[PDB]
Amino acid sequence: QEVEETLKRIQSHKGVVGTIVVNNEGIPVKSTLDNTTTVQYAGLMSQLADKARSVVRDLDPSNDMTFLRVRSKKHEIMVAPDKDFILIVIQNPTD
């Protein structure tokens, strides 16, 4: 399997551009992008996910963020952060 057959099922969703998995540390695990780039996203997104999760935590300590997504003009990035790993996917909206 379900892992390889799911990680790929995403990569081929209509409009998906890239997909990356990281860990708490911000270290890329598997990733469908050129590695020098895949570095960028991991670093930044991990930071973003921290701040956000932290923001969510300060608005309320009994709450934890489950899902975050920032939309640009060019595309949307989403990020599902889950304790030790976080899944980034860039998609190309339509909208």
Partner: protein, 38 residues
Amino acid sequence: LSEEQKQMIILSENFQRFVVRAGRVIERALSENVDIYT
């Protein structure tokens, strides 16, 4: 970090089941952003 290690994780039950969680969570977002019926 290292090579063989990425492997060990990829084949864990920590990750195998995390990828399926995030997976499902996302797969909704993914189809909101896009008309799959067109």
